[PDB]
Write a protein that binds this ligand. Structure first.
Ligand SMILES: COc1cccc(-c2cccc([C@H](NC(=N)N)c3ccncc3)c2)c1
Length: 369
């Protein structure tokens, strides 16, 4: 019943249907592992099909507290309250949770994304205005007998969010676990990066400057400047039979090929080696160009297949975004403070290569900041 409960894409976000208030008001909500507030549009907007009308809910309680969230690309603001919340294609429960009613925003809502709010699945440490605001998943666990775990199968129906468990039909092979370094974002540690089997040969701390996170609310694989520049150099060298505009590598412009002729074989695989559950042991997640080249669907360019390079520079650490998660079944095992990865039953691949999750690997220094 929870299988296939997500819709959406890496570019615009994956979403789950939710209900807020009594009588319930149906809303589409972005599944965001990179934030911790349950924040919903609560006032009309040109990009919103519907919104939260607190006046219609008898169960709404005003917390008499404002919330202002300016971020690098834009802002959201509104006010805090609590109300009854349910996930129609999730667990069979109703919980009372904190809700940030978004009354004003700048570059937050996306035209045609089909979502009206965000379900921030990360920890209280990063909740706004401060850490006393209990995130949704914490309320769900405290109030019910739902196990403290959730899993995400993002399929480039658009995917599945399994609350309280792991669904075996969603993956193949083994689940490999990386520890959650600190409970704020879903922070992890990358120990090694290879591009077409070639080690980038950087000190492993470089990969996690200043943190590395698993974020369903970011499109791209985002890398620290030093790592990004080496990655681009290695991908350029492997795909040298074709020369693309510099705007392509900057994730600014599209690369197009006649429909059905994308030369997948000229692009390398990228392996991210994640820290294992035991000392100096690791496992690798392998990404194909089918993951790092994000198609941009547009009827006007439809004689071709056009893509954006979905690897970009970060000044805030590594972000394993939606394009990376698309290759795998990702278990957020909060109860055991660990993140599991397994090959997704829905990942996009070809007759030559498959995305992989494999290990163990042995190295004989700490890779964290
Ligand atoms: C791949 O999914 C996507 C795609 C497109 C947009 C968004 C998205 C839209 C708005 C905000 C966020 C954004 N979430 C991030 N995790 N970066 C956020 C920022 C501040 N407060 C809460 C959440 C993310 C998420």
């Amino acid at each position: 019943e929870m299988v296939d409960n997500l819709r959406g894409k890496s570019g615009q976000g994956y979403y789950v249907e939710m209900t807020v208030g009594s009588p319930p008001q149906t809303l589409n909500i972005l599944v965001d592992t990179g934030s911790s507030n349950f924040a919903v549009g609560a006032a009309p907007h040109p990009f919103l099909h519907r919104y939260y009308q607190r006046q219609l809910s008898s169960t709404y309680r005003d917390l008499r507290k404002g919330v202002y969230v300016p971020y690098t690309q834009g802002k959201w603001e509104g006010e805090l309250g609590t109300d009854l919340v349910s996930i129609p294609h999730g667990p069979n429960v109703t919980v009372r949770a904190n809700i940030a009613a978004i009354t004003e925003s700048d570059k937050f809502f996306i035209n045609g994304s089909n979502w009206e709010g965000i379900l921030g699945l990360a920890y209280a440490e990063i909740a706004r205005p401060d850490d006393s605001l209990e995130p949704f998943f914490d309320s769900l666990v405290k109030q019910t007998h739902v196990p403290n775990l959730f899993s995400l199968q993002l399929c480039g129906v658009g995917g599945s969010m399994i609350i309280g468990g792991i669904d075996h039909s969603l993956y193949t092979g083994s689940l490999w676990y990386t520890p959650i370094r600190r409970e704020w974002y879903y922070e992890v540690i990358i120990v090694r990066v290879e591009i077409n089997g070639q080690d980038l040969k950087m000190d492993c701390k470089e990969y996690n400057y200043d943190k590395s996170i698993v974020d369903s609310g970011t499109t791209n694989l985002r890398l620290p400047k030093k790592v990004f520049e080496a990655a681009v150099k290695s991908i350029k060298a492997a795909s040298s039979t074709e020369k693309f505009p510099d705007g392509f590598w900057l994730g600014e412009q599209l690369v197009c090929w006649q429909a059905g002729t994308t030369p997948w074989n000229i692009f390398p695989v990228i392996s991210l080696y994640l820290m294992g559950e035991v000392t100096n042991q690791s496992f690798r997640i392998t990404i194909l160009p089918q993951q790092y080249l994000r198609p941009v669907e547009d009827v006007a360019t439809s004689q071709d297949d056009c893509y954006k390079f979905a690897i970009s520079q970060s000044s805030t650490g590594t972000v394993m975004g939606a394009v990376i998660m698309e290759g795998f079944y990702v278990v957020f095992d909060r109860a055991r403070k660990r993140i599991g990865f397994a090959v997704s039953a829905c990942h996009v691949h070809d007759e030559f290569r498959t995305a992989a999750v494999e290990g163990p690997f042995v190295t004989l220094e700490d890779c964290g900041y």
